[PDB]
Amino acid sequence: MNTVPFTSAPIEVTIGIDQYSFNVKENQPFHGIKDIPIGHVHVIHFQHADNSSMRYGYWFDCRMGNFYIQYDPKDGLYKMMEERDGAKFENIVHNFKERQMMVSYPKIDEDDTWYNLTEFVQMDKIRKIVRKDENQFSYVDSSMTTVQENELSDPAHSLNYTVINFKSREAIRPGHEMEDFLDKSYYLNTVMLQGIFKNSSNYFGELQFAFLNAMFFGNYGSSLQWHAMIELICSSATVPKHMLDKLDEILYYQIKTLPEQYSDILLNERVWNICLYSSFQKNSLHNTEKIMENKYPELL
Template sequence: MDPDIAKRLFDEGGTFVLLDVPVGTEFGIDMNTWNVGDKFRGVKMIPPGLHFIYYSAVSKEGSTAPRTGFFHWFEKEEVLARFYSAKDEEITDRRATEDELERFKANKKEMDTFLGVYPYESWKQWVSITNHISKKLLERIQPLCVTIASASNLVRREEQEENIVGEPSERKRHKGSGSATREEDLMSHLICAPGTEIRWSQILGELQFAFVCFLVAHVYDSFERWKRLIDVICRSEKALHDHPGFFMDFMTVLHFQIKLVPQDFFADIVSNNNFLIDALRKFFPNVEEEGSDALVKRAKKFKEHLQDKFEWDFEEENEDDQPVVVDL
């Protein structure tokens, strides 16, 4: 790291202090993951801005628990301190007091050897997939509980209804019918615990939020949301004429997202289902018909890049759209 950048980050960068973490616990920030050692107390020199902090408990046998984490917008020189419960295998709700934070700040140099350095070389990569996620979007879209968990906290729909109206639901009163014992029936009556769900609504920043939540936080529902958003954007014809800047940004965002997806994962989930290829087969012709000259030029370069890199054929017609030949 450049000495001037290192000095500026030491003076102005954020610090995340995490105490009482068991040795071997998987800990990560943004695109970087480690198994902590016995001296670990957190991370220093964090560039100001949006970051995702996450962790997974690791058993003695080496098995890793589902990933849990949270987003945080670090201000200059901010010190964020949290505490880990080995018993519950999670970061607790306890926040450091003002006195504790002042002690951490005052002892910053003494704590230096216990704090890992944020891998600055990965910073540009992180920014490339989060630059449209604003503070305002983060506050509106993240779960009310703030925690992002790859394993959803599910409750029965009837229990939630009972909490709201104060009476057991009709189905709960007649649970002797036996249909609720089937696995598919039970799953259909499970919902995310109130306050734990991601609050989706907007498009461009949300597209990045969904991608980060599935790539880094391992939330599969966010992958499904990412696919739906891409499909909606690629089918939008009138918006191409009205909002050309949006679609310029969309192609840039998608370029960096595709670049970061592991090749084997990308082939297994994306190519086999063909959802991205099918969406772009609609998108590129729409751009040619409705887009400005600059948008058409940018889309052509993006299309050629994908064809060269993945050998995707955007001219091939989707089997579902082809005419069906019937023998009479």
């Protein structure tokens, strides 16, 4: 198990760690999070009590370095940093643990939720979507725009998701206009899977990362990306059986985790009704259709 210590908590803040969250009071003796499961990416996120504007946070993997959080009073936020002195870091953590100044990552043994939401998410792929090469962790916030959003304004602070556009020359072969528009299999299998992502694991990793940034930061462009990547599969008549079965599992856990009270803003009625009831794959997403109908029957 690994640890992300905090120098201190000078401002009152709600801290998220993956799907969990807890409140820290102004100047409360809080010095970080311990017992973080090794083997998965993680996200540590923030919403200030005095200004809920800008949720922000950091994706990281404790196998890649020793990371800690320290508040910056000039830039007004909790920043992730890497400690290169390993002996210094182990000493700091051991002292904070001995003084019991840390919250424990509260994973129930039975509970595979975080694995199920991050199965295909890799830190190396996150770092290509979120470009800041001098750090091993990646900053994301509520307001960051995607490369596609910018085409339709600072590129260094953008989310470089793969552009998906159903009415684009990339999506439509000359001479197969009707075929390719009504059946997106070419665009999914040849252009995206074979061409850009190389395999379905990388496609699912981006899909999962987009969902998590939408849910944890309210990032609108990430929500657009998540729905586009679902619709591309559902609107293809020819999809490998193993991808369809895996997609059903991925979506089921995403829908299960979504706050009931955020459904109005995180779910696109058109896309979901199209995908579950009209698309080529309308009958391939049994687990997802069942949880959607029982949890969000209004949306449908």
